[model samples]
Target: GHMRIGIISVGPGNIMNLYRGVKRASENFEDVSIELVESPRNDLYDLLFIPGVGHFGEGMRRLRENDLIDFVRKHVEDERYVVGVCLGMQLLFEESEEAPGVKGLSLIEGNVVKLRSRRLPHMGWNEVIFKDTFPNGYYYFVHTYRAVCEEEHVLGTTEYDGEIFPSAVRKGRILGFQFHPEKSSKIGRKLLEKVIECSLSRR
Candidate 1:
């Protein structure tokens, strides 16, 4: 059977960058395909990736405006796999300090808070240590808000400015990465592919 991957497109260019990254990551998986999801539809792809950039409220707004929030909610309730990246991962939580009074998708519990020490946005490559299932490597990241993923849901972690936060999390069919696996180069590609492989294998 073919594996369909839906990369939720909330707006602009970053989605295309991620789409290309995913394409290269799955190049060896001959049966895999990728599509951009701009509106809610009936078809249920094997993986729904909610990748992002920009403000938390803005991200929520885009999803809401397109009426894709419930679509995402339905995806979660259906127990299908979802992978969130950076702001995408943050949006999966309850709320964010970045955007007050704004509610998140709440697929996983927690909130997004500003990075404690260091500079404003934590940029550049950092080591990602996965608890299991994937390899440990340095991944590209540039974000001001860090998601506080719960203990049990934590699949991978990283340290920034003396604080430890979940670099990645997995709750059933939901998965999220705080770092940009697409921008992490070859290692990132391997990790992304590994995640894709496991998700399909579990099916």
Candidate 2:
């Protein structure tokens, strides 16, 4: 079995780290291939993943600057699998408070808002409570803002300073993870592998 994975690199962010993480995690899978997508490609892949680690507005800016917003929207519209990690997941929503007047991919109806914690930038590892029978584990998280989405779309949540926010969301073929599964060590690797398996099964 083989799968072609696309790692979307928009602008200046932790693209290399995500690429490496995905590459490392993918090695365990049989015949999994990866590609760095700068612009929208005509060829379709089994999975299209977006990883982010910067400002929300800037991320959307880069996507528009490099002309990829529509490509992403169309992929999901066409019933393909697309995953968003960290800020990449935030971009799946309609908008973000981080970047007012800026719109997201609108793949999911929600808004990315800042966490109301006494401490800024909720970094380090945290436990994610899976809403369904999906894998349950602690994942690496590094973000100040989180998505305020409807209950139907949220698949998992994490409590930060008494506030429970969405850590994972799924709608149809689109999947979003607020945490960095690529950096969560063994747990992260297994999660990515599961993502691949489930993604294939869906198709």
Candidate 3:
């Protein structure tokens, strides 16, 4: 087992941003490395972060094109920690209306659907109400698509234009967030740290 972290690189996800996000979060910790992984190998790292900032379909296509489906799936099957940010979180589900035929990792039982509001993407900072005892504050969000699943699987919720959607979700070692922790400021860094902490706890 190695003591490293991997960030899945998808189109528009900005590999630099993901690197900085994990780097800043793990700055206080010792002996940790962050890498942009195109071909995901399950044994290479303890935790894998899937970060994205664009279309759900394109993201899935990239994962498929890169032959990363099984690599990601295997990591989850082995019970390792995987965190998905923004559209990256949406791909953790079965399917999305964004892409008709594109299949997701399906690691979590859910569907990524379009936000039912006049305003397309729920952009900018918004308050997240945690169902569990997680830090509740403003998190940066920028997406027209959101994940909809059972309430039990929801970790946090945020409201935008009369529509409330799951902003964060978790099931076992797999976690998903609809916001960009990389750009959300201090609390966002803390959230990223929390994910790394949780990943370490699994060891």
Candidate 4:
């Protein structure tokens, strides 16, 4: 029996390479198949990954234009696993200082606040404080916006220029990580395993 996992790639990135990474990451696992879904309304995927690298507002606007905002909301409401990396994570929150008035998935209870750093966009790797015990280690985070969400929503946290923010979060079956797990190495792989475990438990 093949384990089918559906990934969302509505936003821009190295899509082919990302799908390749997903395939590469799950290669050793038995009976695993990575399926790339381009439609937002499908909502039939076993798991989803929202990967993006762009302005928060523009991304939100594009999602709305494609009528994807509601689709993502409904997908989350159904308790399916949705991983939001980078701005993708921010899309789960209520709002972002990056763009006021533009609505987000609001799947996670939080807001994307501006980094207090004088540099604004805190690009590059930083030590993860891993709020509580979480397989433990620093993950790479490169973004100007940060989620200052509630404590319960925070599955993991990381420090940047002395400020801490939610790097990972889980609610029901929904899972989100601010940092790029694919780029986080060991910790990332552990988290991906957890996601698989969590989804299995969800079913």
- Among these predictions, the greatest TM-score belongs to 1
* lDDT (Cα, tens digit) per residue for candidate 2, span 1-203: 56878888765487888888888877777778888988976577678987888998888888889888888878787767899988889999999998989988888899998899979899988889887745788888889999998999998888889999999998988999999887788888888887777766643
TM for every model, in the order presented, reads 0.95, 0.94, 0.94, 0.86
The CA lDDT of each predicted structure is: 0.85, 0.85, 0.83, 0.71
Task: Name model 3 segments beyond 4 Å from true.
Answer: none
lDDT score, candidate 2, position 194: 77
Clash totals for all models, in order?
0, 0, 0, 0
User: What does candidate 1's lDDT look like per residue over 1-203, in tens digits?
Assistant: 88888898874238888888888988878789899998997587788889898899999888889988888878788877788887888888999998899999998889899989768789989998998888898899888988886799998889988988888988998989988878789888898898788658753
Steric clash pairs (candidate 2): none
lDDT of 3 at 83: 80
Measured with C-alpha atoms, the lDDT of residue 104 in candidate 4 is: 77
In angstroms, how far off is 104's CA in candidate 1?
A: 0.3
lDDT of 2: 0.85
Give candidate 3's TM-score.
Answer: 0.94
RMSD values, in order shown: 1.4, 1.5, 1.7, 2.4
> What overall lDDT, based on C-alpha atoms, would model 4 receive against the true structure?
0.71
Residue 27 alpha-carbon offset, candidate 4, angstroms:
2.1
Model 3, span 6-79: residue lDDT tens: 98875455768878878888887767778888885546467888888788788888888888888887878888
Q: Of models 1 and 3, which has the larger lDDT?
A: 1
Between candidates 1 and 3, name the one with more favorable TM-score. 1
